[PDB]
């Protein structure tokens, strides 16, 4: 009885009994995979399947809906959804690096959606972690003296990750990177984004476009 079988699961969701949601969400979306409620079905299973830690899963059922629909009233939620199911799977920086991308793909699309705020606050710890594995290789092509690529991946980072911890260590790799060069302009140039970059942080949340 679809609609009861639909008010059981949401309560099972409610409970955190995800194993039974997901046995009766399946059920009604295997059913009636393009019924009027299909969506909703879907969406609360993107929801189960990332609480149950079944990561895969709720990874594809985003990118189905995405691609099914568009332009959906939430699909601010569902690309909230797959940067925390990337997330997750970052706990080799390639998740870190879906996740920052769904959620700059968010802030960026809804800057006003319910989910901004979180968002913003996990963006922080992605740049920071894939800003220290730039860093990293930037430091290995230091030791092999490949200096062309260290002033490419430190150029990567200050262009986006500007505001982090090792963006401020990899500045002076890449100014010495340009000096090896005999590149004066070039380096002359770090040495000014070096004296510059204040810890102080710049806010804008309270700015609307």
């Keep these: 009885p679809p609609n009861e079988i639909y008010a059981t699961a949401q309560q099972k969701l409610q409970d955190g009994n995800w194993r039974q949601a997901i046995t009766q969400l399946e059920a009604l979306d295997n059913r009636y995979p393009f019924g009027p409620y299909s969506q909703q079905v879907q969406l609360?299973?993107?929801?189960?399947?990332?609480?149950?830690a079944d990561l895969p899963l709720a990874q594809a059922a985003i990118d189905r809906f995405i691609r099914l629909n568009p332009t959906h009233p939430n699909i601010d939620y569902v690309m909230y959804m797959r940067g925390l199911?990337?997330?997750?799977?970052?706990?080799?920086?390639?998740?870190?690096?879906?996740?920052?991308?769904?959620?700059?793909k968010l802030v960026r699309g809804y800057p006003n959606s319910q989910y901004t705020t979180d968002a913003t606050k996990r963006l922080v710890f992605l740049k920071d972690r894939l800003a220290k594995y730039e860093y990293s290789v930037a430091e290995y092509y230091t030791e092999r003296g490949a200096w062309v690529a260290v002033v490419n991946r430190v150029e990567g980072m200050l262009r986006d990750y500007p505001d982090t911890q090792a963006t401020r260590d990899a500045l002076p790799l890449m100014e010495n990177a340009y000096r090896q060069m005999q590149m004066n302009a070039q380096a002359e140039k770090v040495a000014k984004i070096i004296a510059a970059n204040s810890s102080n942080t710049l806010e804008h949340h309270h700015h609307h476009h």
Aim: net charge negative.
């Design 85 to 104: 199911t990337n997330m997750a799977l970052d706990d080799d920086p390639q998740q870190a690096r879906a996740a920052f991308s769904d959620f700059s």
């Design 44 to 52: 609360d299973l993107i929801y189960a399947y990332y609480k149950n």
